[PDB]
Amino acid sequence: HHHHKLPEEQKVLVVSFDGFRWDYLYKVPTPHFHYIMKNGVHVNQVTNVFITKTYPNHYTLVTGLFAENHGIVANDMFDPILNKSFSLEHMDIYDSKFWEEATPIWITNQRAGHASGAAMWPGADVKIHDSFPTYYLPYNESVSFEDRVAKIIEWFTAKDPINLGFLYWEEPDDTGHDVGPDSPLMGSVISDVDHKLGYLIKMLKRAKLWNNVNLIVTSDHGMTQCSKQRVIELDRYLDKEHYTLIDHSPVAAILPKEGKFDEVYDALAGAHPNLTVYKKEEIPERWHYKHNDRVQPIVAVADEGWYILQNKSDDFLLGNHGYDNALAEMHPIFLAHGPAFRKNFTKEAMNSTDLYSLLCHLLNLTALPHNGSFWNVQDLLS
Numbered sequence: 015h016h017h018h019k020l021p022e023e024q025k026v027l028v029v030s031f032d033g034f035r036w037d038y039l040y041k042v043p044t045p046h047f048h049y050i051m052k053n054g055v056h057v058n059q060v061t062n063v064f065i066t067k068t069y070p071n072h073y074t075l076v077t078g079l080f081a082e083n084h085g086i087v088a089n090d091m092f093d094p095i096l097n098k099s100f101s102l103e104h105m106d107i108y109d110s111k112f113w114e115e116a117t118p119i120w121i122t123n124q125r126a127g128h129a130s131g132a133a134m135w136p137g138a139d140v141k142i143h144d145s146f147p148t149y150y151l152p153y154n155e156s157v158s159f160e161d162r163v164a165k166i167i168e169w170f171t172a173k174d175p176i177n178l179g180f181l182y183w184e185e186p187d188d189t190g191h192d193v194g195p196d197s198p199l200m201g202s203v204i205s206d207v208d209h210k211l212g213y214l215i216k217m218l219k220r221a222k223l224w225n226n227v228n229l230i231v232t233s234d235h236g237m238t239q240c241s242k243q244r245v246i247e248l249d250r251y252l253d254k255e256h257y258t259l260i261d262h263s264p265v266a267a268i269l270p271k272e273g274k275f276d277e278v279y280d281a282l283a284g285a286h287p288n289l290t291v292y293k294k295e296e297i298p299e300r301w302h303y304k305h306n307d308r309v310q311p312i313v314a315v316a317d318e319g320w321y322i323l324q325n326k327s328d329d330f331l332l333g334n335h336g337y338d339n340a341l342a343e344m345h346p347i348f349l350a351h352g353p354a355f356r357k358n359f360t361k362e363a364m365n366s367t368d369l370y371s372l373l374c375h376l377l378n379l380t381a382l383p384h385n386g387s388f389w390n391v392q393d394l395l396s
């Protein structure tokens with residue numbers, strides 16, 4: 015018979031499938047994504063932040079800030095005040111000072127008395143302002159999706175449960191790089207990701223969380239097809255001895271050596287039609303990228319689908335991202351299901367800087383100063 019159920023605090027689980035381009039939903043049958051759509055909300059065009067790389071965009075999701083403000087401007091950075099480098103590829107990400115120009119939402123959540131949990135979310139196993147999420151996993155890409163889900167569900171159902179979870183998975187980004195997003199093999203990995211989403215849905219239902227957790231499924235960026243016929247080779251124009259390459263492609267962050275600034279700029283600007291060379295102060299305002307000492311004196315941006323190689327042996331991948339965030343192929347999926355969200359609703363656009371204000375609203379937190387607007391996304395809510 016129908017009876018009372020104890021009022022639960024509002025809960026949110028944010029899931030990021032890395033590199034899940036907005037239109038991947040249509041490359042193969044995605045019944046579990048479509049199940050969420052039919053019972054939830056879906057935004058066609060999510061404008062993420064420049065540069066359209068993993069660490070800048072995940073930190074935007076948990077701060078509501080543009081990259082010049084939260085300071086995670088790239089996956090590879092050099093901070094001249096710290097005189098230190100940051101590099102994802104070397105797992106050299108744990109220097110707290112690279113993160114401390116902002117405060118991620120899990121800290122704000124916990125300062126309000128709640129508990130947060132993170133299962134491989136970029137930056138969640140880093141000490142920031144002397145704090146971690148209440149529960150987190152040390153980053154390890156080899157941990158299965160099923161084990162990450164198991165931890166999330168354990169934490170949402172613990173003696174002292176979390177109200178806010180973050181779950182992360184490295185596909186379809188990794189395969190998109192390997193084969194290129196135009197490859198028919200992308201169907202296999204997208205289908206697998208849809209199966210993993212179905213596994214998550216099944217476990218949320220089994221744990222009696224499905225109808226009381228607001229599940230948000232999104233990503234950090236998309237992916238575009240590259241080609242060995244679309245390469246810009248810097249050593250055709252520049253003496254490698256006269257600059258340091260802080261980040262390579264498709265946004266080359268260039269630090270000329272002492273006195274070589276005008277040599278480097280003059281040699282590279284207009285050298286190739288698909289490489290736009292900006293002096294820091296000329297960087298487009300719409301990217302909200304330039305007001306930060308981690309933005310190097312010269313930033314050279316390749317057009318969509320072009321690769322910057324410093325020399326003939328530099329890295330090349332059939333898929334890449336990082337390009338202009340106005341480009342549709344850089345845009346991630348966004349869909350959601352839960353008691354706070356409408357059902358079978360589709361909206362054309364959102365800015366990824368708005369998610370932070372949505373999360374703060376759902377959890378009844380006081381948002382720190384940010385660049386998004388709850389009013390832009392209030393129509394997703396029931």
Ligand SMILES: *[C@@H]1O[C@H](CO)[C@@H](O[C@@H]2O[C@H](CO)[C@@H](O[C@@H]3O[C@H](CO[C@H]4O[C@H](CO)[C@@H](O)[C@H](O)[C@@H]4O)[C@@H](O)[C@H](O[C@H]4O[C@H](CO)[C@@H](O)[C@H](O)[C@@H]4O)[C@@H]3O)[C@H](O)[C@H]2NC(C)=O)[C@H](O)[C@H]1NC(C)=O
Pocket residue numbers: 287288317318319
């Ligand atoms: C990498 O960099 C290259 C080189 O800069 C860019 O290529 C240019 O792209 C633009 C935009 O499409 C081209 O301009 C358009 O050309 C069309 C005709 O193309 C043929 O003829 C020209 C010679 O005039 C050749 O260069 C070209 O290869 C083709 O053979 C025109 O129809 C277009 O005019 C129409 O659209 C424009 C708006 O785009 C309107 O203003 C017009 O009124 C008209 O309606 C336009 O002129 C340009 O020709 C290309 N240059 C070259 C050398 O190919 C790439 O776009 C860039 N790559 C990426 C991914 O950004």
Ligand SMILES: *[C@@H]1O[C@H](CO)[C@@H](O[C@@H]2O[C@H](CO)[C@@H](O)[C@H](O)[C@H]2NC(C)=O)[C@H](O)[C@H]1NC(C)=O
Pocket residue numbers: 363364365368390
């Ligand atoms: C994404 O953010 C931009 C920038 O804030 C929004 O563009 C502004 O929209 C307001 C209306 O609320 C206009 O008054 C401003 O002139 C716009 N500013 C700029 C710089 O264009 C945009 O609406 C947001 N998009 C979504 C889908 O939320």
Ligand SMILES: *[C@@H]1O[C@H](CO)[C@@H](O[C@@H]2O[C@H](CO)[C@@H](O)[C@H](O)[C@H]2NC(C)=O)[C@H](O)[C@H]1NC(C)=O
Pocket residue numbers: 079080083302383384385
């Ligand atoms: C994005 O949001 C941040 C936070 O509100 C803004 O940063 C502030 O900018 C003012 C100048 O208007 C400075 O006085 C503050 O010191 C900044 N605060 C922080 C925390 O950095 C930023 O201006 C916003 N960006 C845009 C493009 O609107």
Ligand SMILES: *[C@@H]1O[C@H](CO[C@@H]2O[C@@H](C)[C@@H](O)[C@@H](O)[C@@H]2O)[C@@H](O)[C@H](O)[C@H]1NC(C)=O
Pocket residue numbers: 097098099100
């Ligand atoms: C700056 O620091 C150097 C040692 O640190 C390494 O190099 C810097 C540039 C960063 O890449 C950092 O992450 C590395 O661990 C010193 O060798 C160098 O002398 C220092 N320079 C000055 C001027 O103090």
Ligand SMILES: *[C@@H]1O[C@H](CO)[C@@H](O)[C@H](O)[C@H]1NC(C)=O
Pocket residue numbers: 154155156157
């Ligand atoms: C990551 O997880 C795997 C599987 O349990 C384990 O073999 C490995 O030692 C872990 N640590 C790292 C740094 O990969």
Ligand SMILES: *[C@@H]1O[C@H](CO)[C@@H](O)[C@H](O)[C@H]1NC(C)=O
Pocket residue numbers: 325326327328
């Ligand atoms: C390219 O640059 C690397 C440094 O990253 C250097 O070790 C390598 O020998 C260079 N290769 C060519 C072909 O110039």
Ligand SMILES: [Zn+2]
Pocket residue numbers: 032033067068069187234235
């Ligand atoms: Zn990514």
Ligand SMILES: [Zn+2]
Pocket residue numbers: 033187188191335
């Ligand atoms: Zn990637």
Ligand SMILES: [Zn+2]
Pocket residue numbers: 155184188
């Ligand atoms: Zn990987």
Ligand SMILES: [Zn+2]
Pocket residue numbers: 188189191192
């Ligand atoms: Zn690979």
